[PDB]
Amino acid sequence: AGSYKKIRSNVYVDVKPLSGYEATTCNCKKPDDDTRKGCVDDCLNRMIFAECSPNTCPCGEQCCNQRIQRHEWVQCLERFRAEEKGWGIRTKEPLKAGQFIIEYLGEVVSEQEFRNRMIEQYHNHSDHYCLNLDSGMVIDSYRMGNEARFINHSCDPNCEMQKWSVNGVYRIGLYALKDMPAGTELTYDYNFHSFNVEKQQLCKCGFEKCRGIIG
Numbered sequence: 001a002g003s004y005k006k007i008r009s010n011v012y013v014d015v016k017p018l019s020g021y022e023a024t025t026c027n028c029k030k031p032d033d034d035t036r037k038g039c040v041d042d043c044l045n046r047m048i049f050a051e052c053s054p055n056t057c058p059c060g061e062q063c064c065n066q067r068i069q070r071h072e073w074v075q076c077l078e079r080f081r082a083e084e085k086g087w088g089i090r091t092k093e094p095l096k097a098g099q100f101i102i103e104y105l106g107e108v109v110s111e112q113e114f115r116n117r118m119i120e121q122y123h124n125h126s127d128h129y130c131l132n133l134d135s136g137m138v139i140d141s142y143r144m145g146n147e148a149r150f151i152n153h154s155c156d157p158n159c160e161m162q163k164w165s166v167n168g169v170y171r172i173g174l175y176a177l178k179d180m181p182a183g184t185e186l187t188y189d190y191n192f193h194s195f196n197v198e199k200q201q202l203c204k205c206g207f208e209k210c211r212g213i214i215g
Protein backbone atom coordinates (compact mmCIF):
# COMPACT_ATOMS: atom_id res chain seq x y z
CA ALA A 1 0.00 0.00 0.00
CA GLY A 2 1.97 2.92 -1.41
CA SER A 3 2.88 6.33 0.05
CA TYR A 4 3.32 9.69 -1.65
CA LYS A 5 3.21 13.45 -1.04
CA LYS A 6 -0.20 14.84 -1.91
CA ILE A 7 -0.17 18.10 -3.93
CA ARG A 8 -3.10 20.30 -5.14
CA SER A 9 -1.34 21.40 -8.38
CA ASN A 10 1.72 20.38 -10.44
CA VAL A 11 5.25 20.97 -9.17
CA TYR A 12 7.39 22.33 -11.98
CA VAL A 13 10.90 21.00 -11.79
CA ASP A 14 13.15 21.78 -14.80
CA VAL A 15 10.65 22.62 -17.55
CA LYS A 16 7.54 24.57 -18.39
CA PRO A 17 4.98 22.98 -20.70
CA LEU A 18 3.91 26.20 -22.45
CA SER A 19 1.26 25.61 -25.11
CA GLY A 20 1.80 28.64 -27.34
CA TYR A 21 -1.86 29.59 -27.47
CA GLU A 22 -4.13 31.71 -25.39
CA ALA A 23 -7.69 30.43 -25.01
CA THR A 24 -9.22 33.58 -26.38
CA THR A 25 -12.79 34.94 -26.32
CA CYS A 26 -15.43 32.51 -27.64
CA ASN A 27 -18.76 33.53 -29.22
CA CYS A 28 -20.79 31.57 -26.70
CA LYS A 29 -23.82 33.40 -25.32
CA LYS A 30 -24.53 33.81 -21.61
CA PRO A 31 -27.91 32.10 -21.11
CA ASP A 32 -30.45 34.40 -19.42
CA ASP A 33 -31.35 31.70 -16.83
CA ASP A 34 -29.20 31.74 -13.63
CA THR A 35 -28.46 28.00 -13.41
CA ARG A 36 -28.15 26.99 -17.08
CA LYS A 37 -24.46 26.44 -17.93
CA GLY A 38 -22.68 28.26 -20.78
CA CYS A 39 -19.68 27.42 -22.98
CA VAL A 40 -20.87 23.84 -23.42
CA ASP A 41 -21.51 21.99 -26.70
CA ASP A 42 -20.05 24.35 -29.35
CA CYS A 43 -17.69 26.57 -27.43
CA LEU A 44 -14.86 27.83 -29.63
CA ASN A 45 -12.31 27.27 -26.85
CA ARG A 46 -13.52 23.82 -25.82
CA MET A 47 -13.32 22.64 -29.44
CA ILE A 48 -9.55 23.01 -29.42
CA PHE A 49 -9.14 21.62 -25.85
CA ALA A 50 -8.42 25.11 -24.48
CA GLU A 51 -10.15 26.34 -21.34
CA CYS A 52 -11.79 29.76 -21.20
CA SER A 53 -10.11 32.60 -19.31
CA PRO A 54 -12.25 34.16 -16.54
CA ASN A 55 -11.15 37.59 -17.83
CA THR A 56 -12.44 37.07 -21.40
CA CYS A 57 -15.30 34.57 -21.32
CA PRO A 58 -18.65 36.00 -22.52
CA CYS A 59 -20.49 33.55 -20.25
CA GLY A 60 -18.84 34.91 -17.07
CA GLU A 61 -19.68 32.71 -14.08
CA GLN A 62 -21.75 30.25 -16.07
CA CYS A 63 -18.66 29.34 -18.10
CA CYS A 64 -18.43 25.64 -17.60
CA ASN A 65 -15.13 25.45 -19.56
CA GLN A 66 -12.75 26.27 -16.67
CA ARG A 67 -12.84 22.90 -15.01
CA ILE A 68 -9.10 22.30 -14.57
CA GLN A 69 -8.40 25.94 -13.54
CA ARG A 70 -11.05 25.76 -10.83
CA HIS A 71 -10.03 22.27 -9.66
CA GLU A 72 -13.57 21.01 -10.22
CA TRP A 73 -12.85 17.40 -9.33
CA VAL A 74 -15.50 14.81 -8.66
CA GLN A 75 -15.76 14.09 -4.89
CA CYS A 76 -16.93 10.51 -5.07
CA LEU A 77 -13.64 8.69 -5.69
CA GLU A 78 -12.34 5.92 -3.49
CA ARG A 79 -9.10 3.97 -3.25
CA PHE A 80 -9.68 0.19 -3.01
CA ARG A 81 -7.75 -3.06 -3.34
CA ALA A 82 -8.24 -4.36 -6.91
CA GLU A 83 -7.75 -8.07 -7.45
CA GLU A 84 -4.33 -8.69 -9.07
CA LYS A 85 -3.66 -4.96 -9.67
CA GLY A 86 -2.61 -3.61 -6.27
CA TRP A 87 -4.73 -0.57 -5.43
CA GLY A 88 -7.29 0.99 -7.73
CA ILE A 89 -9.70 3.89 -7.86
CA ARG A 90 -13.46 3.42 -8.09
CA THR A 91 -16.33 5.92 -8.19
CA LYS A 92 -18.98 5.82 -5.46
CA GLU A 93 -21.60 7.55 -7.72
CA PRO A 94 -22.62 7.41 -11.41
CA LEU A 95 -20.57 9.42 -13.87
CA LYS A 96 -21.59 10.40 -17.38
CA ALA A 97 -19.78 10.21 -20.68
CA GLY A 98 -17.57 13.23 -21.39
CA GLN A 99 -17.60 14.36 -17.75
CA PHE A 100 -14.39 15.78 -16.24
CA ILE A 101 -13.19 13.66 -13.39
CA ILE A 102 -9.86 14.84 -12.00
CA GLU A 103 -6.57 16.50 -13.00
CA TYR A 104 -3.50 14.24 -13.17
CA LEU A 105 -0.93 15.73 -10.86
CA GLY A 106 2.79 15.24 -10.25
CA GLU A 107 6.18 16.77 -10.81
CA VAL A 108 6.68 18.04 -14.35
CA VAL A 109 10.18 17.07 -15.43
CA SER A 110 12.14 16.86 -18.76
CA GLU A 111 12.57 13.42 -20.25
CA GLN A 112 16.29 13.58 -19.27
CA GLU A 113 15.41 14.23 -15.58
CA PHE A 114 12.84 11.41 -15.54
CA ARG A 115 15.37 9.07 -17.08
CA ASN A 116 17.91 9.97 -14.31
CA ARG A 117 15.23 9.38 -11.70
CA MET A 118 14.45 6.01 -13.27
CA ILE A 119 18.10 4.99 -12.80
CA GLU A 120 18.89 6.70 -9.51
CA GLN A 121 15.60 6.29 -7.66
CA TYR A 122 12.96 4.13 -9.30
CA HIS A 123 14.91 1.32 -10.95
CA ASN A 124 13.68 -1.16 -8.35
CA HIS A 125 9.99 -0.20 -8.32
CA SER A 126 7.27 -2.65 -9.18
CA ASP A 127 4.61 0.03 -9.88
CA HIS A 128 4.93 2.88 -12.32
CA TYR A 129 3.52 6.42 -12.02
CA CYS A 130 4.17 8.64 -15.00
CA LEU A 131 2.25 10.40 -17.84
CA ASN A 132 3.56 11.80 -21.11
CA LEU A 133 2.96 15.45 -21.25
CA ASP A 134 4.42 16.67 -24.47
CA SER A 135 7.56 17.81 -26.25
CA GLY A 136 9.78 15.53 -24.18
CA MET A 137 8.21 16.39 -20.82
CA VAL A 138 6.58 14.02 -18.39
CA ILE A 139 4.31 14.14 -15.29
CA ASP A 140 6.08 12.04 -12.65
CA SER A 141 3.91 10.98 -9.80
CA TYR A 142 6.28 8.46 -8.17
CA ARG A 143 6.87 10.91 -5.25
CA MET A 144 4.16 13.62 -5.43
CA GLY A 145 0.66 13.57 -6.93
CA ASN A 146 -2.94 12.88 -6.16
CA GLU A 147 -5.29 9.89 -6.27
CA ALA A 148 -5.28 9.81 -10.09
CA ARG A 149 -1.93 7.96 -9.66
CA PHE A 150 -3.76 4.92 -8.44
CA ILE A 151 -6.01 4.63 -11.55
CA ASN A 152 -5.29 1.33 -13.27
CA HIS A 153 -4.78 0.45 -16.95
CA SER A 154 -7.39 -1.22 -19.12
CA CYS A 155 -7.15 -2.49 -22.71
CA ASP A 156 -10.88 -1.56 -22.79
CA PRO A 157 -10.87 1.71 -20.81
CA ASN A 158 -13.82 3.68 -19.36
CA CYS A 159 -11.83 6.91 -19.10
CA GLU A 160 -9.25 8.86 -21.04
CA MET A 161 -6.54 11.45 -20.41
CA GLN A 162 -6.92 14.69 -22.39
CA LYS A 163 -4.30 17.34 -22.82
CA TRP A 164 -5.65 20.83 -22.36
CA SER A 165 -4.24 24.28 -22.80
CA VAL A 166 -4.96 26.05 -19.51
CA ASN A 167 -3.99 29.73 -19.36
CA GLY A 168 -1.27 28.87 -21.87
CA VAL A 169 0.06 25.80 -20.04
CA TYR A 170 -0.52 22.17 -20.95
CA ARG A 171 -2.22 20.23 -18.17
CA ILE A 172 -3.87 16.84 -18.18
CA GLY A 173 -7.38 15.91 -17.07
CA LEU A 174 -9.11 12.54 -16.85
CA TYR A 175 -12.57 12.45 -18.58
CA ALA A 176 -15.16 9.67 -18.67
CA LEU A 177 -15.38 7.81 -21.97
CA LYS A 178 -18.79 6.27 -21.14
CA ASP A 179 -21.48 6.25 -18.42
CA MET A 180 -20.44 4.31 -15.35
CA PRO A 181 -22.60 3.26 -12.44
CA ALA A 182 -21.75 3.44 -8.75
CA GLY A 183 -18.95 1.04 -7.76
CA THR A 184 -17.21 1.09 -11.18
CA GLU A 185 -13.35 0.97 -11.18
CA LEU A 186 -11.86 3.84 -13.25
CA THR A 187 -9.38 2.82 -15.98
CA TYR A 188 -7.56 4.36 -18.92
CA ASP A 189 -5.32 2.98 -21.60
CA TYR A 190 -1.68 3.54 -20.56
CA ASN A 191 -0.26 2.64 -23.97
CA PHE A 192 -1.54 5.94 -25.20
CA HIS A 193 -0.80 8.26 -22.30
CA SER A 194 1.77 6.56 -19.99
CA PHE A 195 5.50 7.21 -20.51
CA ASN A 196 7.36 4.29 -22.06
CA VAL A 197 9.80 3.11 -19.37
CA GLU A 198 10.99 -0.05 -21.17
CA LYS A 199 9.78 -2.42 -18.42
CA GLN A 200 6.79 -4.46 -19.54
CA GLN A 201 4.13 -5.90 -17.23
CA LEU A 202 1.42 -8.51 -17.58
CA CYS A 203 -2.01 -7.04 -18.13
CA LYS A 204 -4.74 -8.30 -15.82
CA CYS A 205 -7.51 -5.97 -17.10
CA GLY A 206 -9.57 -9.09 -17.88
CA PHE A 207 -10.89 -7.83 -21.25
CA GLU A 208 -11.88 -10.45 -23.91
CA LYS A 209 -9.38 -8.86 -26.29
CA CYS A 210 -6.80 -7.76 -23.71
CA ARG A 211 -3.45 -6.98 -25.39
CA GLY A 212 -1.83 -9.16 -22.72
CA ILE A 213 0.84 -6.60 -21.82
CA ILE A 214 0.96 -2.99 -20.50
CA GLY A 215 3.57 -0.98 -22.52
Ligand SMILES: C[S@@+](CC[C@H](N)C(=O)[O-])C[C@H]1O[C@@H](n2cnc3c(N)ncnc32)[C@H](O)[C@@H]1O
Nearest residue numbers: 085086087127128149150152153202203204205
Ligand atom coordinates in the same frame (compact mmCIF):
# COMPACT_ATOMS: atom_id res chain seq x y z
C1 LIG B 1 -0.32 4.20 -12.06
S1 LIG B 1 -0.08 2.67 -11.13
C2 LIG B 1 -1.71 2.13 -10.57
C3 LIG B 1 -1.68 1.81 -9.08
C4 LIG B 1 -1.16 0.43 -8.68
N1 LIG B 1 -2.16 -0.63 -8.95
C5 LIG B 1 -0.89 0.50 -7.17
O1 LIG B 1 -1.49 -0.23 -6.37
O2 LIG B 1 -0.12 1.36 -6.76
C6 LIG B 1 0.32 1.45 -12.40
C7 LIG B 1 0.73 0.11 -11.79
O3 LIG B 1 -0.40 -0.63 -11.38
C8 LIG B 1 -0.35 -1.96 -11.81
N2 LIG B 1 -1.41 -2.13 -12.82
C9 LIG B 1 -2.23 -1.15 -13.32
N3 LIG B 1 -3.07 -1.71 -14.23
C10 LIG B 1 -2.78 -3.02 -14.35
C11 LIG B 1 -3.30 -4.03 -15.14
N4 LIG B 1 -4.30 -3.76 -15.98
N5 LIG B 1 -2.81 -5.32 -15.01
C12 LIG B 1 -1.77 -5.59 -14.13
N6 LIG B 1 -1.24 -4.57 -13.36
C13 LIG B 1 -1.74 -3.31 -13.45
C14 LIG B 1 1.01 -2.12 -12.47
O4 LIG B 1 1.93 -2.50 -11.47
C15 LIG B 1 1.35 -0.72 -12.89
O5 LIG B 1 2.73 -0.48 -12.92
Ligand SMILES: [Zn+2]
Nearest residue numbers: 026028039043
Ligand atom coordinates in the same frame (compact mmCIF):
# COMPACT_ATOMS: atom_id res chain seq x y z
ZN1 LIG C 1 -17.36 29.49 -25.06
Ligand SMILES: [Zn+2]
Nearest residue numbers: 039052057063
Ligand atom coordinates in the same frame (compact mmCIF):
# COMPACT_ATOMS: atom_id res chain seq x y z
ZN1 LIG D 1 -16.24 30.05 -21.52
Ligand SMILES: [Zn+2]
Nearest residue numbers: 155203205210
Ligand atom coordinates in the same frame (compact mmCIF):
# COMPACT_ATOMS: atom_id res chain seq x y z
ZN1 LIG E 1 -5.55 -5.90 -20.76
